[PDB]
C-alpha cells in the first residue's frame, strides 16, 4: 500500500512505503485525528520479537541479513533473554540504534544531521557521581568552544523498572525559575517546579534571573543527588541587537547548548531511561518560545515599548514586529560570538532536502507537520506547503513521566 | 472516547463528547496520521433516508421538539417523499439550520464564532445561469454592504441525478486573473492561471492586466457554463498603502474586500448542494501572508525588502520576516482606512478560543484542525497555538468537490 504526499508549492509528489514498517500506534482513529495532541514494566514475553525486529533491521543495514553472524546473534540474544530476561546491545548496535532513534524522530526538523551523532556509551556507570562525570564530558565535547557537535550519552538500561537511571532535569542546561510571593516569576517560568525540587533537596539558590540549575541525577533507582555543572563548561551568549543599542540593556542571555535529558530511548525492546542528547539551537526556539511565549520570559511588552510601537490595538502587529526583532537579536548574538545556530529558513530548507532524500533512499520520512513548521513566519518556509505523513518507527525517543511523580523514595 | 484537550498556556482542560457523533471519516488510521494532507475529502433511497433521519433528529432536538407531534410527522413525510421521489426537499427552516450548522462544523475555520449570524439566500427556484447570475450579484451586494461586511450563503438547487448539477466554476466569486508569460513566469495571479485560460478559451476578453477581476462561469441544470461579468460597482477593492512607507503605494497593490468561496459542496441530510457560494470577511494574513508572499502566489517579498534596504544577502537577517510583517501591517491599515471589515490574526484566534470555550460548554465539543486554525505567521504568539484540538467530521458540512471542467460532460 503506497501513499503519496504533495508539495503544494512545487507540485512535487513523493511515494511513501516506509509507513508499512510502522508498528506503534499514532493515537488517531479512523474517525478522529489527534494530530495536535501533545502526548498521545516490560517482560521477557514480548521482548525477543522486539529484539528480532531490531536485529533484522540492523543486519539489513550492514547488508548481512541472514548471514551466519546474523543468525548467531539472534541465537545469542534468545539465550540471554530466556535465562536473564533482558539482553545487552553490542557497541555497534547501540550506535546504530541511537542514530536511528533520531532519524525516526518525526517532530525534529534538524534530522539532516542524524548520521553524525557522537554516541557516548555510559552503560558501565553505577552511581550518581559517575553520571555527573559522564554529563560533564558530554557538555564539554558537545560545546567545543561554540562549534557545537551532536552527541548522546547512554546510561544503563531499565531492568525491573525499580533501578532506573534518570536525569531529573528536562535539559542539562536550564535557567532556574522562582515564584515570588506577589505572583510574579523570577527567571524562567518553565522551570519553577523543578527549581523548588532542587531547593528542597538542598540547593543554595542565588535567586537571580539567569541561574544555571544544578544537575539532579538518579543512579540504579536510588534517591537523586545534586551536582553543580562547572561554570566554565556552560557557554552563554549575551543577547544584543545589531541596530538597537538599547537591546543589550535588557540584560538577556541564553546558553548555547540545547541538551534534552528527560526522554526515553527505546532500542530492540530495551528502555534507556537516561539518555541526554544535544544538538544546536534553531534560533526561534530561543527567540519565539523561550522569551515571548505568554508562559515564559514575556519580554515582548518591554521590547515593543522600547521600539515605540502602537501598542493600543493588536492590529498594529506590534507583537509580530517585536518578535521578529528579538529573533534577529538572537541570531546576531550567536553568530557574532561564533556559537553554532541555525535560522528557521535554513533549517526548514535543509529538512525538505533531507525529507526528499529519505523518500528516495528509505521510502519515507515520518514527519509531524504541527511540530516541523516553525513557530513564526510559517508559510514563508518551505515546510508549510509540504504534506507530511506521521507514523511511529523504532528505534524511537519516547516521553516518560517526570520521575518525582513515580519515584519511590529511599531517604 | 470521552476525550480531553489541554491548553498548555493556561492549563485549561476541556472534555469532548461531541466527537462520538462524528459520522464521516478523517483519513487517519491507527498506524498513520494524515492531519497535514490537503485533500482526503449518485445516491440512493437506501442511504438517503438514514441521512435524512439523522439530520431531522438533530434539527428537532435543536428546537426542543424531539419525539414530538411535528417531529414524527416530518419523519414519515420525508420517508414518504424519498420512497416516492428518490429524494426530498428541505423546509426553509431546516435549510437555514442546515447551512448554519455546516459553517459551525467547518473544523478548518477560525471565524466560526459568527456561525449563527449567517444570512441564507434560498435560490432553489433558480433554473438558468442568468438567474444564477442575478442571485450572485444580489449576494455580493448584500454581503459587501458598503464595506460593512455581512456573512451570507446562497443555495442553488440540489443535485438530482448528477447530470443536472448547478456549479459555479470559479473557486471564488471575486478573483484576479492570471496570465502565463511567453518569456518569464506569471502576471496577475498564479493561482488562477488555468481558470483564466478556461475563461478566455471559453470566450472571455482579458484586459491582460495585473488585477483583472475574473468573470463568473455559471452552469445551470448541468448545461454548458456561461460567462458573466460582475458589475464593477459591486466589486469593492482596497488599494494597499502603508502607514509609514510612502513608497508602498508605489507598488500598485490592491485587494478585493469580499472573500466568497464558490466551489465547495454543501451536504445537508444527505442532499448535495453543488453550488452554494458563501462569504464572510477576511483575516489580515489571508491577503498579506498567503495571497501576496507565497512562491505559489504574488511573491512580492523580493521587492518590499529591497525598498526597505534590508540585508538580503543571508536568510539569517530575517528580512523575509521583517518584510512579511510590514506587508500585513499595510493590508490591515488599508482595509481599516477605507472602513472595509477585516480582522487581524490575534483578534480572530482569541475570538476562536472563546468560541471553543462556548462549544465545549453548550455543545460538548468543537471539531478543530490545528494545521489550518493556526495563522501562517506568528503562530506561537496567538492563543490557538498552545490549544490542543480534536479533528472529526460532523454533518451538515461543506466539502470539496472536483473541478467541473474535468467532470462536466461538455
Ligand atoms: C543538531 C541540530 C538540531 C536541531 C537544530 C534540532 C531542532 C529541533 C526542533 C526545533 C525541535 C522542535 C522542538 C520545539 O521547537 O519545541 C526538535 C525536536 C526534536 N528533536 Fe531535534 N534538533 C537537533 C538535533 C537533535 C538531536 C541530536 C536529537 C537526538 C539525538 C534530536 C531529537 C529530537 C526529538 C526526539 C525531538 C521531538 C521530541 C518530541 O517528540 O517531543 N534532535 N528538534
Ligand atoms: C466571517 C468571517 C470569516 C473569517 C474571518 C474566516 C476565516 C477563515 C480562515 C482563516 C480559513 C482558513 C483558510 C486559509 O487561511 O487559507 C477559513 C476556512 C474556511 N472557512 Fe471560514 N471565515 C469566515 C467566514 C466563513 C463563513 C461565512 C463560512 C461558511 C458559511 C466559512 C467556512 C469556511 C470553510 C468551510 C473553510 C475551510 C474549507 C476547507 O475545509 O478547506 N467561513 N476561514
Ligand atoms: C536535541 C535538540 C536540539 C534542539 N535544537 N532542539 C531540541 C528540542 C527538543 C524538544 C523536545 C520536546 C519538546 O517538548 C517538550 C514538551 C512536552 C509537553 C509539553 N510541553 C513541552 C521541546 C520543547 N517544546 C523540545 C528535543 C531535542 C532538541
Ligand atoms: C468564507 C471564508 C472567509 C474567509 N475570510 N476565508 C475563507 C477561506 C476559505 C478557504 C478554503 C480553502 C482554502 O484552500 C485552498 C485549496 C485547497 C485545496 C487545494 N488547493 C487550494 C483556502 C485557501 N488556503 C481558503 C474558505 C472560506 C473562507
Ligand atoms: C500542507 C498543508 O496541509 C497545507 O499547505 C495547508 C497548511 N495550513 C494551511 N492553513 C491555512 N489557513 N490555509 C492553508 O491554505 C493551509 N495550507
Ligand atoms: C497543542 C500544540 O500541539 C502544541 O502547542 C505544540 C504545537 N507545535 C509545537 N511545535 C514546536 N516546535 N514546539 C512546540 O512546543 C509545539 N507545541
Ligand atoms: Zn491524525
Could you describe the 3D structure shown?
Two copies of one chain form a homodimer. In chain A, a hairpin with a 6-residue loop joins strand 8 and strand 9. In chain A, the strands form seven sheets. Chain A has a four-stranded mixed sheet, sandwiched between helices. Chain A has a three-stranded antiparallel sheet with strand order 5-8-9, covered by helices on one side. Chain A is of the alpha+beta class and 411 residues long. Chain A contains eleven helices and 18 strands. Chains A and B meet through strand 1, helix 6 and helix 8 of A and strand 1, helix 6 and helix 8 of B. One copy of the ligand Cc1cc(N)nc2cc(-c3ccc(OCc4cccnc4)c(CN)c3)ccc12 is lined by residues 38-39, 259, 261, 278-280, 282-283, 286 of chain B.
Q: TL;DR?
A:
2 copies of one chain form a homodimer. Chain A has helices at 47-61, 68-84, 91-103, 128-143, 192-200, 283-292, 300-307, 318-336, 344-362, 369-372, 403-406, and strands at residues 3-7, 12-16, 118-121, 151-154, 166-167, 177-179, 185-187, 215-218, 225-227, 236-238, 253-255, 259-260, 264-267, 270-272, 277-278, 281-282, 341-342, 396-398.
